[PDB]
Amino acid sequence: DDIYKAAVEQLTEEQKNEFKAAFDIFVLGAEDGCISTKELGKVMRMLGQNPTPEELQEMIDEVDEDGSGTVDFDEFLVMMVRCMKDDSKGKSEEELSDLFRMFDKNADGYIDLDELKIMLQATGETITEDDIEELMKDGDKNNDGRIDYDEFLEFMKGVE
Template sequence: MSDEVLASIAESTGLDSEQIDALKKGFDGFDKEGAGTISETNMQMILKSMGIKVDKAEIENAAAEVDEEGTGKFSLTMFATVAARFMSEDDEEQMKEELKEAFRIYDRDGQGFITTDVLKEILREIDSTLTEDDLDNIIEEVDEDGSGTLDFDEFQEMMMG
């Protein structure tokens, strides 16, 4: 497998080299004849073995989109395209859980919001190079109603872009 092919997979899927490497290992394990393709069932098995939650109907839909000719055979690039959907959804779910946990920690009184002063503290911890002006601009942007507080949805939107 050439570096160019791996680079194009990374570019088109947004997966990092570790993730692509893991997919390639699984792919190679099922492509015993070296035909360069695997089946849809193999794709499901590889993803499950990697601990990625896969809904059968969802993978069938994703597979059908990349298998335009309906051959039922998937190259590594096609497999990575399908896998990327499930891998990034997984990451997003995990990130939401981590954000909920962080929000709970900073919402010390359990009121369902954090103050903009607490948000400034968080932002300073994340990036110590931010100036007071930077912080004020960020606060102005995320605290649209000027209430001086952020609920979880506003906090999540800011953190996830």
């Protein structure tokens, strides 16, 4: 699926290398190599965070969808990418404001829907309905008809 490679792309190499070499703190010998789900909470204490029963149980629910009682390495990477939200070691904002200038091609102060449609089709994918619809739900909150720099920053947080 595309979530596995998106998690690959949204996380830096040093972080994931340390994550895996440090997950290898539970394995000791003559083991399957994949530790029980609950032990995952313990590696998190090593990470420096102090999560809570609600998030812990939810996050537990975020692994092992098919119901094997065990976690693989790709689910491991997607959950880790889904845990700390400080992606890209802090997404920038200045060049991003330049990119805000980029979304607008009529120099008005905001992003028109037509400008978004041309921007999206310039990638190579055409327009489908769920695309723009979901992109609007992600970007906007009150039907203001445009994407300003706050909603701009919010929508793509962590994305490189």
